């Protein structure tokens, strides 16, 4: 039964109960149903008013935070001052493992681009202007900094400096379906050429970033970090949290560590015996 | 115009902040929402589903053998079968469970827990068990007559194949912490031990070694607070195809 | 008792079981045809009803001491079988639910437990390599595959947490059968039958079986019945 639950449930006092035919502590796990036995019926309790809020475990709260989807350091010298990143959430394992707790997701991305400049191995730190253009799937990808593909009449671009606050835009839910597929069992193509699972093809397209200025001054290191905070989140069909470490970002393939914890044979660190404990 | 002045925290990027930002795709209509089964609108819906504890973790148990506890007929009365360390933050039976994996994203926790043990032995197998829970403040009970003194359930095998051991909420505070101290008064949950109440009697035809399967789930009064990064997933050196996405 | 016995009548097929527990409905949903407001493809779909809705028994597998478990992917298991398999070939799209019934029985002197779980969108991995699984590895047809490492569910997740999915247990002490009713689970309202597999039926022996009685083969039989089938895109068969 669906209901509005803003807080944890209160407890009611119970008394000594001995009765035939009534066994609250018995259940059947073969039914695949969690035990419905209440603390009131299992033990003798007192009335407790529980004011503890459940609001912080909401999926809108749990999954919506700024995490690092992409980190790209490109050297700025005479050359090449741009990079094209095919958008995926499988890149960094911190956000990846949290988003994989659900099978399907429907959310709006809020993207933020943090820019920093470093010295290669002092005079001053230059202020550079960077462009971040969002290229949908099936469009022409810029092959050069000064190439004609950066005119971007139809495409969505953004201009920002290093001194200015981080550039921030919102990306709507663009999937052709009702929600994203975190895990996809099958192949995209109608022929055997398709790849198993989601491939960096359909999904969200590309993000192209360059430095708008020409090449000056003498080389510095410019690192572009990209952050994504979901919003308006809908989640379906939760899934077991992954244990073994990741191998590739395009698949689920696993290996496992040499020794526990998170070993292939043993996820939990071993102990002497089930009877062993101080 | 409107006279203004900036405040501290101007231009800062806070990862948890809540604000509206400029849309990059004007006049874009997302795909109409379709009803899909299994919507999770709160994570406490997930933690209340019972999942298998790994009690048998040892160096001699490999793979799936770690999720069952061997129960053999014993020749001495009043014998301990096994015990469950209740520390969720540390590495133990409760870490790989649903209630464990979700709770490790949160620094504080509250509410009752429940354990469920299913006896997978043969139909003709019979026996009585006792599942004890000792509140903190002392060493684990070595013997049953010391362990009875706490919350316990005496269980007899029968048609119903499972029990429910409710671990009640007992604390001096509204919440408990996952801080790395195992014996901390704000951390230690107590101890759970299982003793033979009478004995396990099996016919000569049935297999002598029977296996319990432990479960654990949060209750309806369970709660979590102060979300944090999960220590479970660690750094990963070589991540394949990650560099391929940069062209 | 009341819910220990169950009968399932779909089409010309019928299944009775005298040992069962309270058949499961996945996520509290029950299969239904695609409503008019969720429809996309304009062509009038075809509804075989009693033709394609009935129990198709899959090849039984032998439960042995070192068995790791079995999986069947749907529809893929049903694509070659019966009138269901013909509509799959001639039509471009389908929408249906599934009713899965697993039969495993033994004498009261056998001990063992099976975890029968339907994993929505199960993406399989490969052990100790970066190479994505091939087509023939994932698609086994009717016979289905076998878990290499059932402890991790072959995807790297935990078998301990597999109860979050729709599931039932077959405990050789209690019940000899498990029943799960699966609605249509997909992001898209209809789907291409050959490439994409919505559900993965996974039978895993959490507790193996052993006894001191004279040994005998214990098979595990699976009966899968489609429900509320629709099809669009009538054309020639792929064959």
């Amino acid at each position, epitope marked *: 039964i669906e209901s509005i639950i803003k807080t944890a449930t209160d407890t009611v006092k119970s008394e000594i109960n001995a009765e035939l035919g009534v066994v609250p502590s018995l259940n059947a796990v073969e039914t695949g149903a969690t035990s419905n036995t209440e603390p009131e019926e299992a033990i003798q309790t007192r009335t407790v008013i529980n004011q503890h809020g459940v609001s912080e475990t909401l999926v809108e709260n749990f999954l919506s935070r700024a995490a690092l989807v992409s980190k790209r350091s490109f050297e700025y010298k005479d050359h090449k001052n741009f990079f094209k990143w095919t958008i995926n959430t499988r890149s960094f394992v911190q956000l990846r493992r949290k988003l994989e707790l659900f099978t399907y997701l429907r959310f709006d991305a809020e993207i933020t681009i943090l820019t920093t400049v470093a010295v290669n191995g002092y005079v001053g730190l230059p202020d550079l202007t960077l462009q971040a253009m969002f290229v949908p799937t099936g469009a022409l990808t810029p092959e050069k900094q000064d190439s004609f593909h950066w005119q971007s009449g139809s495409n969505a671009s953004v201009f920002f400096k290093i001194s200015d606050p981080p550039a921030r835009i919102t990306i709507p839910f663009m999937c052709i379906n009702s929600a994203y597929s975190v895990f996809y069992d099958g192949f995209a193509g109608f022929e055997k*050429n*398709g790849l198993y699972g989601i491939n960096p093809a359909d999904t969200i397209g590309n993000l192209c970033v360059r430095i708008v200025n020409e090449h000056q001054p003498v080389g510095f290191t410019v690192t572009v970090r990209v952050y994504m905070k979901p919003k308006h989140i809908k989640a379906w069909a939760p899934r077991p949290p992954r244990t073994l470490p990741y*191998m590739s970002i395009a698949n689920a393939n696993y*290996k496992g560590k040499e020794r526990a914890p998170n070993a292939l044979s043993a996820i939990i660190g071993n102990r002497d015996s089930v009877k062993t404990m101080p | 115009g409107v006279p203004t002045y900036l405040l501290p925290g101007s231009g800062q990027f806070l990862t948890t902040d809540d604000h509206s930002s400029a849309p990059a795709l004007p006049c874009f209509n997302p795909t109409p929402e379709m009803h899909i089964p299994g919507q999770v609108r709160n994570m406490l819906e997930v933690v209340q589903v019972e999942s298998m504890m790994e009690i048998n973790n040892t160096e001699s148990a490999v793979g799936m053998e770690r999720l069952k506890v061997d129960i053999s007929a014993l020749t001495d009365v009043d014998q301990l079968l096994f015990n469950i360390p209740l520390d969720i933050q540390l590495d133990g039976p409760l870490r790989n469970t649903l209630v464990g994996n979700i709770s490790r994203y949160y620094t504080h926790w509250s509410g009752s827990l429940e354990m469920t043990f299913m006896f997978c032995g043969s139909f003709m197998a019979a026996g009585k068990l006792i599942l004890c829970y000792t509140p903190p403040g002392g060493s684990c009970p070595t013997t049953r007559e010391t362990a009875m003194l706490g919350t316990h359930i005496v269980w007899d095998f029968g048609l119903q194949s499972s029990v429910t051991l409710i671990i009640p909420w007992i604390s001096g505070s509204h919440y408990r912490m996952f801080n790395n101290d195992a014996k901390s008064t704000n951390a230690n949950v107590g101890y759970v031990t299982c003793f033979m109440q009478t004995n396990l009697i099996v016919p000569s035809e049935s297999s002598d070694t029977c296996s319990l399967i432990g479960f654990i789930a949060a209750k309806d009064d369970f709660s979590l607070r102060l979300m944090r990064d999960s220590p479970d997933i660690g750094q990963l050196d070589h991540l*394949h195809a990650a*560099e391929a996405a940069y062209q | 008792y009341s819910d220990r016995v169950l009968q399932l009548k779909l089409g010309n097929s019928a299944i009775v079981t005298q040992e069962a527990a309270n058949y499961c409905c996945a996520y509290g949903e029950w299969p239904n045809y695609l409503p008019d407001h969720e429809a996309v493809a304009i062509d009038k779909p075809t509804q075989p009803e009693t033709a394609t809705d009935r129990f198709y028994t899959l090849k039984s597998v032998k439960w042995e001491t070192g068995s790791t478990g079995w999986w069947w992917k749907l529809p893929d298991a049903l694509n070659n079988i019966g009138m269901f398999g013909q509509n799959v070939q001639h039509h471009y799209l389908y929408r249906s639910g599934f009713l899965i019934h697993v039969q495993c029985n033994a004498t009261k002197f056998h001990q063992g437990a099976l975890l029968v779980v339907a994993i929505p969108e199960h993406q399989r991995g490969a052990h*100790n390599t970066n*190479t994505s699984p091939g087509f*023939d590895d994932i698609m086994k047809g009717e016979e289905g595959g076998t878990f*290499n490492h059932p402890y991790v569910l072959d995807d790297g997740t935990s078998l301990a947490c597999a109860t979050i999915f729709p599931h039932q247990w077959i405990n050789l002490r209690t019940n000899n059968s498990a029943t799960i009713v699966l609605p249509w689970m997909n992001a898209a309202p209809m789907d291409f039958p050959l490439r994409h597999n919505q559900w993965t039926l996974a039978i895993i022996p959490v507790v193996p079986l052993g006894t001191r009685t004279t040994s005998s083969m214990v098979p595990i039989t699976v009966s899968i019945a489609p429900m509320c089938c629709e099809f669009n895109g009538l054309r020639h068969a792929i064959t």
Partner: antibody, heavy 119, light 108 residues
Framework: QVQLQQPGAELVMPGASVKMSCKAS????????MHWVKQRPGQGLEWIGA????????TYNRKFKGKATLTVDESSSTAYMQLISLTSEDSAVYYC????????????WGQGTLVTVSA | DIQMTQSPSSLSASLGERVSLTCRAS??????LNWLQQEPDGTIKRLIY???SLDSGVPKRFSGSRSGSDYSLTISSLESEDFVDYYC?????????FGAGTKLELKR
């Protein structure tokens, strides 16, 4: 240190069977995947299949399904390839290479064996 | 089956001349590719792994890069022993496929 050598493959009559033996040494045998490649005198390469050394698990190319059968022995640290339905078209040079997730596969190779038939 | 199209199938060059070898990937295979050098005796020796790096102990005459879907094996300066059949492997997905190959000959 690390070496791969497979002997044998001299003369086999058509319709008979042949058992390839490729021995591995210099590392932990169960920590790496095993691959098989054939080369005809036509100099083109085809990929027979790969066996997971961790257990029996095997992956084949669709063309060689039922023609080739891969098996290993964890003790001898050797990998076997069972070729049935032997024909003159099956005569070629067969290779065995290592594998595994880290630092890409096919880091090491074998000597190769030219199979011939006598009719 | 992702088909690796290797071109050109043959070439002719003299000593100390820069040559390149390109393989096509129909479906995107990412960064996963291997360049294989097979000496006339039948011994195969890998050169480039994951297109990024070179094997240990292999001369630096060989380089590799990805531009779009093109995977280029560039040789700075040819040598007498460097005329042999070259191959490109894809470990991205099963089954693994090989390029058609390229033969190197000396100008006469």
């Amino acid at each position: 240190q690390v070496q791969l050598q497979q002997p044998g493959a001299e003369l086999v009559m058509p319709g008979a069977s042949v058992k390839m033996s490729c021995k591995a040494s210099g590392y932990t045998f169960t920590d790496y995947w095993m691959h098989w490649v054939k080369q005809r005198p036509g100099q083109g390469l085809e990929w027979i299949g790969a066996i997971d050394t961790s257990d029996s698990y095997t992956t084949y190319n669709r063309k060689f399904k039922g023609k080739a059968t891969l098996t290993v022995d964890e003790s001898s640290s050797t990998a076997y390839m069972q070729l049935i339905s032997l024909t003159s078209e099956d005569s070629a040079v067969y290779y065995c290479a290592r594998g595994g997730g880290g630092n890409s596969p096919f880091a090491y190779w074998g000597q190769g064996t030219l199979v011939t038939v006598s009719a | 089956d992702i088909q690796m199209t290797q071109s050109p199938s043959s070439l002719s060059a003299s000593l100390g001349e820069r040559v390149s070898l390109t393989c096509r990937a129909s479906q995107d295979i990412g960064s996963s590719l291997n360049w294989l050098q097979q000496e006339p005796d039948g011994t195969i020796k890998r050169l480039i792994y994951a297109t990024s790096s070179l094997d240990s102990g292999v001369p630096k005459r060989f380089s590799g890069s990805r531009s779009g879907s093109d995977y280029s094996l560039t040789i700075s300066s040819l040598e007498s022993e460097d005329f042999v059949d070259y191959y490109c492997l894809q470990y991205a997905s099963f089954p693994l496929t090989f390029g058609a190959g390229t033969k190197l000959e000396l100008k006469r």
